[PDB]
Design a protein around this ligand. Structure first.
Ligand SMILES: [Mg+2]
Ligand SMILES: [Mg+2]
Ligand SMILES: [Mg+2]
Ligand SMILES: [Mg+2]
Ligand SMILES: [Mg+2]
Ligand SMILES: [Mg+2]
Ligand SMILES: [Mg+2]
Ligand SMILES: [Mg+2]
Ligand SMILES: [Zn+2]
Lengths: 24, 214, 135, 137, 83, 102
RNA sequence: GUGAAAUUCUUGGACCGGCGCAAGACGGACCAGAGCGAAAGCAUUUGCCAAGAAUGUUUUCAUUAAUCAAGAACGAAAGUCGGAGGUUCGAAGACGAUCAGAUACCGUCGUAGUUCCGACCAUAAACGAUGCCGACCGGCGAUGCGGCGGCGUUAUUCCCAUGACCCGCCGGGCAGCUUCCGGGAAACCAAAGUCUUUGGGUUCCGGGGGGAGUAUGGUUGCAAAGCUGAAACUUAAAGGAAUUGACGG
């Protein structure tokens, strides 16, 4: 996988995790 | 259905007395019907024509505008409206390993016309020069340009439009710029690249008629 | 087309020219006859192919040197080339074009002031370099 | 009549032929010396129906022949030439129709004056179309 | 050249060398007697003068300071001082 | 593996160079990196120089020249065969190719 | 307009040509292995404002210096907020193509943006993938600046300067060619040399590959995100440079 798009996918996952922690 | 080229009648074009050739060529326009006056139809027409076609044995890389201002009979009387260098000459002017100097000035003629003057020059490599590049330092370029501005305006604001045209037909100004600039940096292909009209003095009919007369 | 000689025929032709030069001549048929006994060649086609290139080579070497070598051909051609034997040497010039700097060097050597020598006008302009850059 | 002036036999009359020979099209446009009055304008698009040969030499030479007979019909013998490419920020060399229209006009009974390039040359244009990665092909 | 005589270099290359890169430092500049026109006295002007030196008695300027060395006006005779 | 000492561009003392657009595809290419081919073409092709000169009303006219400076990205330059791949030693030669004028 | 097309505009005068006007961008060719700047970066003319390197210096102070935790200024583009302006181009989006499909590459429009002012952000393959200061160690030809010399040609005038060239020298630069200086795994590098013959001064920083620049904590931010930053677990290779072959739309 292209490293730039792996980085972009990682940012999506981080934003999802922050959403779930804020939910709790 | 019927073609309108039958309704078009032909006229001739007449140059100012600056030149030994008087007839530029022929135009066409429709007849005068209703509010459509053919006289005002011809007025405001420019004619990009070679200087060599205007003189006898001059160069062909200059071109004049020669807009019409008065029409009488079959004669469309034109007056000087601008001069420019031909595209192939300007493109051949630009060379690598040398410096280009350009200047633009605003000069008001004693007659009244307003002229924007464009002049270009290039540095020169000596016959014995071995260095590939002939570059002029920035202050040298500035002094060349300042000299170009001052001794272009000092001869054009001092005489009317008629004297201006009859002195730029051999580009005697470019020779004067070229001669004066040698003490700072020698130049070879110096020409007045372009000149354009900005204002016109209230369209005196007598001034046009004396410009085409005595 | 297609008459190029193989290295087999060429080298064999050269070798017999090296060893047997006097025995051979300008005639093709005579050369092919001497080729019979100075060397053994199992093929008649190779025999007269070798002999054909021998006559071609010997015709060339009759008026010049080639990549083949004969010890005689070295010695008599060095005995020849004696000289053009000019009546005088080419370096005994009555007057010699000498730069003023050169005469200064000669008087530093102390061998200056020779009536044979005469000084020349130094060149002026100092423009000896070619114009740098393409043209 | 004859749709022309009363010019003498020896004296020639000069038109101006603007040849906007870009890619995919070949404009042939003969006007008068002022340029405000046109005599004839024929284009390779109006001479062919294939829509891909609109800048082709064949269509350009057909346009040149057609405009030549119209100029002779209306009484024009000589013709200045102003060749023009696409210009602007786009390409600057003329397309394939410029050369065939030039030869066809000359060979169809016409005189040639002065030829000049009038391609619009920006000092510095706006941003060109295509993006910074260009036309990926 | 491995065996260059560093201790005793000939004067021409010492003069050619930079002043600090000489074997012993020596300024390139010098003082010189300058005679302004229309006077009698002799004034000293630095060869690398930075200020406009003025002949006191005679009105005309002597040297215009430039980049490297002073610019002596025409007619100003100058003599060196002990090399 | 640094292929070229100059990294394929003539930039030594600069930090940044303003770009240009390829005249074939409009690729944004640094100006010091692009291939510049300055062509001097005849206005009229060599097959029709006769027809224009014959039809010219002037007794002696000189056909003009097109002065177009062309800027290429290296991909359009290679595709259009303006520049070719060279050997490792051949790449170090910066002299322009011969004109083969005679 | 394209490979061919199509969407789109068109007898309402499209395109083309001419004369004009307005707008907002952008400063071609000259423009270079050229200049400046700490980098980012900087190209129309003229003026003003401070600033700066180098050169010149028999001027002045006399060690005032080098690198630097903490801290601080600047910092492409994109992005955010507020206000103007919106020409072109153009994320998103729509349509037309193409394809088995085509959420694309191609074409026509087109939002945010691209432009300016202010306030944020602090990130790039921010690259020379290469710390700074200092010393030493080959040659050659150029080039930019400054200075010093000299045959000569040119500029004008009546002589010198003084400019344009020409032949050199010095110093500071951007670089280049060559070399069995030496180094290195080699590619290559006059530095990436002066290294087992190992120590000039001093910052930052790496420790097999992944997990992972992730989790968590703290801090910055309007947000996007930035800075700092693991572990469990998993794996015998991952990599670098060159060589031969094989293959290439
Ligand atoms: Mg491709
Ligand atoms: Mg950069
Ligand atoms: Mg349509
Ligand atoms: Mg930005
Ligand atoms: Mg906004
Ligand atoms: Mg658009
Ligand atoms: Mg240190
Ligand atoms: Mg590790
Ligand atoms: Zn391209």
């Amino acid at each position: 996988m292209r490293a730039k798009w792996r980085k972009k996918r990682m940012r999506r996952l981080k934003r999802k995790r922050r959403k779930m922690r804020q939910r709790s | 259905v019927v073609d309108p080229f039958s309704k078009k009648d032909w006229y001739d074009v007449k140059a100012p007395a600056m030149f030994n050739i008087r007839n530029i060529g022929k135009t066409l326009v429709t007849r005068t019907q209703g509010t459509k006056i053919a006289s005002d139809g011809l007025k405001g027409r420019v004619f990009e024509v070679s200087l060599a076609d205007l003189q006898n044995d001059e160069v062909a890389f200059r071109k004049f505008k020669l807009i019409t201002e008065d029409v009488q009979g079959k004669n469309c009387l034109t007056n000087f409206h601008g001069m420019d260098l031909t595209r192939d000459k300007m493109c051949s002017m630009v060379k690598k390993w040398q410096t280009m100097i350009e200047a633009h000035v605003d000069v008001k003629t004693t007659d009244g016309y307003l002229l924007r003057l464009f002049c270009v020059g290039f540095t020169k490599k000596r016959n014995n020069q071995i260095r590939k590049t002939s570059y002029a330092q920035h202050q040298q370029v500035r002094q060349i340009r300042k000299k170009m501005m001052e001794i272009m305006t000092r001869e054009v604001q001092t005489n009317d439009l008629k004297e201006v045209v009859n002195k730029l037909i051999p580009d005697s100004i470019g020779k004067d710029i070229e001669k004066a600039c040698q003490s700072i940096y020698p130049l070879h292909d110096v020409f007045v690249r372009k000149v354009k009209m900005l204002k016109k003095p209230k369209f005196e009919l007598g001034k046009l008629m004396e410009l085409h007369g005595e | 087309m297609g008459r190029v000689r193989t290295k087999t025929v060429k080298k064999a032709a050269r070798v017999i020219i090296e060893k047997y030069y006097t025995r051979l001549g300008n005639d093709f048929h005579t050369n092919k006859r001497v080729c019979e006994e100075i060397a053994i060649i199992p093929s008649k086609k190779l025999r007269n192919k070798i002999a054909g290139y021998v006559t071609h080579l010997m015709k060339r070497i009759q008026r010049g040197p080639v990549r083949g070598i004969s010890i005689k051909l070295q010695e008599e051609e060095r005995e020849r080339r004696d000289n053009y034997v000019p009546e005088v040497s080419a370096l005994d010039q009555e007057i010699i074009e000498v730069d003023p700097d050169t005469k200064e060097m000669l008087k530093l050597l102390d061998f200056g002031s020779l009536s044979n020598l005469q000084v020349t006008q130094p060149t002026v302009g100092m423009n000896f370099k070619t114009p740098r850059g393409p043209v | 009549i004859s749709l022309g002036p009363q010019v003498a036999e020896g004296e020639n009359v000069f038109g101006v032929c603007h040849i906007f020979a870009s890619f995919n099209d070949t404009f042939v446009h003969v006007t008068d010396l002022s340029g405000k009055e046109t005599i004839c304008r024929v284009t390779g698009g109006m001479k062919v129906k294939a829509d891909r040969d609109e800048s082709s030499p064949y269509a350009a030479m057909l346009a040149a022949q057609d405009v030549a007979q119209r100029c002779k019909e209306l009484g024009i013998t000589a013709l200045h030439i102003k060749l023009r490419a696409t210009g602007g920020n786009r390409t600057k060399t003329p397309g394939p129709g410029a050369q065939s229209a030039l030869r066809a006009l000359a060979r169809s009974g016409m005189k040639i004056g002065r030829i000049e390039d009038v391609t619009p040359i920006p000092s510095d244009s706006t941003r060109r179309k295509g993006g910074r990665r260009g036309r990926r092909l | 050249p491995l065996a260059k005589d560093l201790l005793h270099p000939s004067p021409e290359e010492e003069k050619r060398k930079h002043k600090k890169k000489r074997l012993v430092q020596s300024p390139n500049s010098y003082f010189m007697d300058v005679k302004c026109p229309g006077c009698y006295k002799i004034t000293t002007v630095f060869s690398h003068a930075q200020t406009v030196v003025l002949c006191v008695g005679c009105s005309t300027v002597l040297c215009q300071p430039t980049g490297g060395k002073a610019r002596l006006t025409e007619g100003c005779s100058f003599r060196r001082k002990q090399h | 593996t640094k292929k070229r000492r100059n990294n394929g561009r003539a930039k030594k003392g600069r930090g940044h160079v303003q770009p240009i657009r390829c005249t074939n595809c409009a690729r944004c290419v640094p100006k010091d990196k692009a291939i510049k081919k300055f062509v001097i073409r005849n206005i009229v092709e060599a097959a029709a120089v006769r027809d224009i000169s014959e039809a010219s009303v002037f007794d002696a006219y000189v056909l003009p020249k097109l002065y177009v400076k062309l800027h290429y990205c290296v991909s359009c330059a290679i595709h259009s065969k303006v520049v070719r791949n060279r050997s490792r030693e051949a790449r170090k030669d910066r002299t322009p190719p011969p004109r083969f004028r005679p």
